[PDB]
């Protein structure tokens, strides 16, 4: 599904999920401090498998 192409999960060297933070960004924001500037990286060692299977080929 083409959506997966612009979705944080790119193909890295090793082959794992490139994620960010889906905590709260746009709509609904105006509390806490650096919780907003927390746009780092994400990695999951339990949903990589069932995730790269819709984009592994089109790396």
């Amino acid at each position: 599904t083409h959506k997966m192409a612009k979705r944080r999960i790119k193909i890295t060297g090793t082959g794992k999920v490139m994620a960010f933070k889906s905590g709260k960004r746009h709509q609904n924001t105006g509390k806490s401090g650096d919780e907003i500037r927390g746009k780092g990286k994400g990695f999951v060692l339990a949903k990589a498998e069932w995730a790269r299977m819709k984009l592994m080929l089109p790396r």
Binding site: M4, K6, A19, F20, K47, W50, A51, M53, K54
Partner: protein
């Protein structure tokens, strides 16, 4: 011969048959039958709900030419743009980039399409000249 001709001893293994096993009821117990549309993708099970977009472009991809390919081995048979096809850098349709990875002193000349700063301050530093299109 044609009768003493065996197999690779571990090439093709017998196929899996589901009929008869004195205790085989293939698939789950319930909710799995004549229905192959479950899938593992979708849009609510670990997929969507994720907050991205970015912006897709994909313009020009260059061909990495490891410095160790030019230097190290080989006897400089000139790079140019035709004789370099035989240097295991056959791609076509895209320009060629020079990058620095091998550290070794040797005077060679390089004729690619684009090159990196370090590469230029690496080839000339040991003798040679990198020529780029006008």
């Amino acid at each position: 011969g044609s009768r003493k001709d065996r197999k690779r001893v571990g090439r093709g293994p017998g196929g899996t048959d589901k009929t008869a096993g004195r205790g085989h009821k293939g698939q789950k117990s319930r909710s799995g039958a004549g229905k192959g549309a479950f899938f593992e993708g979708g849009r609510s099970r670990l997929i969507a709900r994720l907050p991205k977009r970015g912006f897709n472009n994909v313009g020009t991809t260059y061909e990495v030419v490891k410095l160790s390919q030019l230097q190290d081995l080989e006897d400089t048979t000139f790079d140019r743009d035709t004789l370099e096809a035989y240097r295991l850098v056959r791609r076509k349709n895209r320009p060629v980039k020079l990058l620095a990875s091998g550290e070794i002193s040797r005077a060679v000349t390089v004729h690619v399409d684009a090159a990196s700063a370090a590469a230029i301050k690496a080839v000339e530093a040991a003798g040679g000249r990198v020529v780029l299109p006008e």
